[PDB]
């Protein structure tokens, strides 16, 4: 299109001269070998084209050729389990060709072009097609692909090709204008997938973790974040929301993220089972990954292209839920393209739009009802870093008053070993008094009654604690003991989960419900016997403790007699004294 | 005493970080307009 | 007109132009493109070599060949009316509804003219709200701007709500016209997202109170300096609705914090000299510009009182938005996040929220001639309780005098029964028996602040 | 050859040689001057005016009409053969030794060339150590990084020759062929005096294990780019060993905290930005370059495993250097203060250290089936005697009990006899042992982590 050279090179920012009508927000290809990049900046006749590769070694001199098409995706079938670079080329592909090493310039199609797929119409000519209806679907594994309308596409149908089996390079359904559709489309990443209208989420997001589903829920359509220093927990908690959760795909991102994380999901994922059908766990998983020592701008490129995966999926009638993972990342690549086109910066460093940026991403994520009448829901699930461990980062701070749930890990409970170490005093869920129609329906009658018993057990047995710091387990009451050890049974006991288990690893909520249940009757029942008058040493040692203390490693196959048997042992064992 | 001495540390490391941005960007204003008054000289 | 071809720079949120002398400085511009699509603008620092805009939508797909600006109007003006009362814009002022838009009856700017100092009047009537925390400690008259230092997780979207669903006047308290005076919202929202947006919609539809108040949108997913303009259109509709057609408004402005953001960022994209911790040096006089627009004047009846909702961002009063925000209105109500913890509700911490204009809007002949005096003697008390808390965290509960513990229980029991109201309507009477009641736990003669006479009058 | 005069602008650092095309960015140039003396430099920031040069030594003694750079290669690199395995070279790759120089059989490029995410496997076997506390609790695995996070006054280099003095990967525990994996050690060094250059020089040729490694040394009087240029040459080294000679590398790097202060220099000079007290932006963009450098691929069958040895500024563990380094390496193994004071070596306090690939490379076939059992055991253990330690400490020994006595005791024998370890060479079956004997002061039953078939076999 537009034909220009290099002027200046300056780390990962190029110039190039002699570029007039080149606009604004484009691809272009750089240098001699193909190194896509971005204009993002235009003086005079130049533009300041922002490379995603290595850019070293490049002369001044060598052509730069534009396109005109601002960053597009190639969304169709034969997405879903498979790995993806930032910029959405298959990682598989390019190492069987080009050795176990990551080379530039290799160039790869998005999707693949030589399987084909049995075809079947849903569109008889002269219909009426408009934007965003169905034309026909082809089976995936244990799915349904649909082939929608490309949004602000409408016409006349005029021939539809019959049923068989046809590549993803065939026009299958010919409009009256003249136009052709195939069996995918390609939309920019810079903009949002328009909708009907949004909804407003009544549904949980049952992830497995009995802190997560029980203290701070998070409705089906909302966002949330996990901050926390180093060494806390947040990929085991990342990757075990990744394979428990209750959608029907999952979209990792990763973007500054160690690849040894990317290579346990892929060489973990295929031996497992998605707990909704039954097929292999990776067949509902489209992960992205580039990695910390691969380029930085495709860091950027990498969080758009996940967001409009899970927007494209939203739009075919499924429920997925998408995890980020650092978004700090994110915001050290854009104050470091920042510091090169050399503007003046904001507190520490940041150039003052990070927070729009943020807003933007975290906006487009709700549940909607889509332009073919059927519902959808997009979950979001963001990590964050701090620099030193303090929720006090511009990333950390605008990143709140943004979010839904909030999820503060701690390094106190990470460094005694009190793992998923979320500090039950420092979080908050505003999704918590829109799901009770939802518990009251489905789980129990009395389960909200419950569950606030068990947190202001937690919020006045904490003022205590710190006179027991003070003076000692001894001077306390029969009153404040009775206190101490039932908030220490349920700390050690409920709240506590060991995720590397082959059976405490997920926990149903009608299991939740049951071991609350059995630690508010043991409090119940101990209270009147201690008034009874008996002591607290032998309210302790009954062996019922740790018939209760082994609650959460039996199975959900036959949790109910186990409870039942329990709850009849307490009544027993608290009736003789 | 320790708790009080941490604190301390941390106000401190906090006040002496918010003055490398007042020289930075006073530099930055420096050389704005060393490159305008290398232009002013009649108009 | 198509006229103004030839800019010849463009990076982020500013684009210039070459010779270009007969833009008035701050005009109006639009920036149509290659394709059709119009965007607009505003001209800063016109010069004669070139002119800089202010480009509101964005700058994606303006290339330097094709591309052109064109002249609108030389001053920015809201085409304003009356009917206009049921409507629902958004940021610059189209119509995001499924009606056409108004036929205008005046069109007025939208940045300023002040009021004479010579042309006001004291704000003295009195608007009670149903909140004992607000009516008897901090009154709220007509006529004064008082915000919400609200926080990250707390409330504060419904205690707006609430406010605005139960504020009525008391006509038969002072002598006036029985029943005269229902309110009218302009309601004015930059950067909220989808759920406050839709809680706040709920809420207003379920009272009927929407179809008397006028709704700027300015959510999250769209441009900044849109933000920056909406608070001035729903201002200038305000001013008008009041000061020409004898209204009562009440203008809730949410989130004050995203505003500076904008204007911070389109400052340092113009390196601007920042004044501190960022955001730059005339910071303060743009709060004071779409700050001191409400008040009441003499002659007319009309009156415009404001509730700026903003976050403060890191819990801190130290930061400059609250530090400036606090010089310059009169007043100030904050949440409290400790409070908020134990089920409180409204969390309103009663010590570090205060308002100036209560001491001329309550007393005798308007409330009642004894509520001062109570309010001093609750504070006086309640802290007195506060610092008996740190007492005991330093000594225990066992080792204090007889009456430190009635201190003690008055401050617990302040914060169980006077402050926690559910979502209950009170009245100034029933909030002044309350108050009246916990005032009575302490023993007499220990409040110097009350006077004998109506110390023995209510016990 | 004599190319490319006519510079223009030196200035401290830089040097700014005009009209030059054929430079490409990052390539390596050679100031010669006036006396034949020759020194490096880097084409940073080539443009079409002028390509700005950075000098690697010093700028003494340098004119714009006698100077003149000319290329040396496109990109930097260094020769590697197989025979330096019992070399020891400095920095840049120069032989300082009492042998010639090496022949290369090719030159390879010393930077970047990340792996592909899907050609790599899961660290698997394990790597003894002879240290009780890391093989027992924390043990290392074949191809992972675990720092040690040091001090300004403890023993690290001691401990760093230790390690690299007795590790050996045990063929015999869980299955293979005993004599066929080789091993090797690519000991790098930055910022060391002469009393620890010669303390490793001796060490490493008293035991004659100088016969399996190589050595770069980086003497604290030399030009900062070669302690930035070290790391680099030895990972070279290390992943052509390693991915094609098969070899089982172990590198062990010294001082990051100079690395990381040279680093923080040699950018300052350029005018970017200072990130977070002192050190530029992308210091975690600099780490992660050269840790991600080891890691084991399939289909190969060598590997490659790192400790980089770094000493925590003021004992801060928020710090930007150790917190950089803990956000990108997978476990860390922290040596402790109070342990040294008490005369404990090597003093290491087993509380906030693990590792996290740990469980991969241990259990069922691996080592022996009671591994991760006695971890758990000895970690509550000490755990508990810690916290009556800490309860005692604080009241009095008056109204102890037993199962406390019993927890006590295990604590001070465990301090006394399992970290406590001289400079013996303990095999995996002997600290087991010792595991054991110390499990054997607890009553059967109430150690209620591990099986009972292991309990019936031992203790």
Known sequence: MIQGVIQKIAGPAVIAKGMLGARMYDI??????????????????????????????????????????????????????????????PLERIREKTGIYITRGVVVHALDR???????????????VRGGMVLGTVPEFGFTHKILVPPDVRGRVKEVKPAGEYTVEEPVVVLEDGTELKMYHTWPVRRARPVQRKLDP????????????????????????????????????????????????????????????????????????????????????????NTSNMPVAAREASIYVGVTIAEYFRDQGFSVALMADSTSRWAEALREISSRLEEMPAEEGYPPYLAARLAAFYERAGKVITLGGEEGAVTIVG??????????????????????????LDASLAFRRHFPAINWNGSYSLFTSALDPWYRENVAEDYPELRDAISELLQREAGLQEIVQLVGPDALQDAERLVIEVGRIIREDFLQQNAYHEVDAYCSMKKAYGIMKMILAFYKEAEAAIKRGVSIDEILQLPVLERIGRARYVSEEEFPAYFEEAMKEIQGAFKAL | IPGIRAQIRFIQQVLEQREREDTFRLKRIKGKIEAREAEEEGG | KKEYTGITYISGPLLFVENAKDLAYGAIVDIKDGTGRVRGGQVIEVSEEY???????????????????????????????KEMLGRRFNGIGKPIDGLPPITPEKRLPITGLPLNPVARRKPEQFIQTGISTIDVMNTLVRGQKLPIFSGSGLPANEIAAQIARQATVRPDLS?????????????????????????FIQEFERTGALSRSVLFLNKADDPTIERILTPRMALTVAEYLAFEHDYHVLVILTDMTNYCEALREIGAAREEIPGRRGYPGYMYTDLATIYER??????????????????????????????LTGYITEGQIQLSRELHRKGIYPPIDPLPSLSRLMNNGVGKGKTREDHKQVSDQLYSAYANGVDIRKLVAIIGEDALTENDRRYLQFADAFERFFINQGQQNRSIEESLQIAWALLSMLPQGELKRISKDHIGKYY
């Open chain 3, 294 to 323: 409400a008040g009441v004047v003499e002659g007319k009846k009309g009156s415009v009182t404001q509730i700026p909702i903003l976050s403060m961002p890191d819990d801190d009063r130290t930061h400059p938005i609250p530090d």
């Open chain 3, 175 to 199: 002598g006036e016209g029985e029943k005269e005076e229902p309110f009218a919202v302009v309601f004015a929202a930059m950067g909220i997202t989808q759920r406050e947006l839709s809680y």
């Open chain 3, 51 to 81: 002119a800089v805009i202010q480009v509101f939508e964005e700058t994606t797909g303006l290339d330097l060949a094709t591309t052109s600006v064109s002249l609108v109007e030389d001053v920015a003006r809201l085409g304003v009316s």
């Open chain 1, 383 to 408: 990590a964050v870093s701090p620099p030193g461990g303090d929720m006090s980062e511009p990333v950390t701070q605008s990143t709140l008053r943004i979010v839904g749930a909030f999820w503060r």
């Open chain 1, 202 to 289: 009544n549904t949980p997001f049952l992830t497995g973790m009995r802190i997560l589903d029980v203290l701070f829920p998070v409705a089906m359509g909302g966002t949330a974040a996990i901050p926390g220093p180093f060494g806390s927990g947040k990929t085991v908690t990342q990757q075990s929301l990744a394979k428990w959760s209750n959608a029907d795909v999952v979209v990792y991102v990763g973007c500054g993220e160690r690849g040894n994380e990317m290579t346990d999901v892929l060489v973990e994922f295929p031996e497992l089972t998605d707990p909704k059908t039954g097929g292999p766990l990776m067949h509902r998983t489209v992960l992205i990954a």
């Open chain 1, 114 to 128: 030589e399987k084909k797929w049995a075809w079947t119409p849903m569109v008889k000519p002269g219909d009426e």
């Open chain 1, 28 to 89: 272009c290809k750089v240098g001699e070998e193909g190194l896509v990049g971005e204009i993002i900046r235009l003086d005079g006749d130049t533009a300041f084209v922002q490379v995603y590769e290595d850019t070293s070694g490049l002369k001044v001199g060598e052509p730069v050729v534009s396109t005109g098409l601002p960053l597009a995706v190639e969304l169709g079938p034969g997405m879903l389990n498979g790995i993806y670079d930032g910029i959405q080329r």
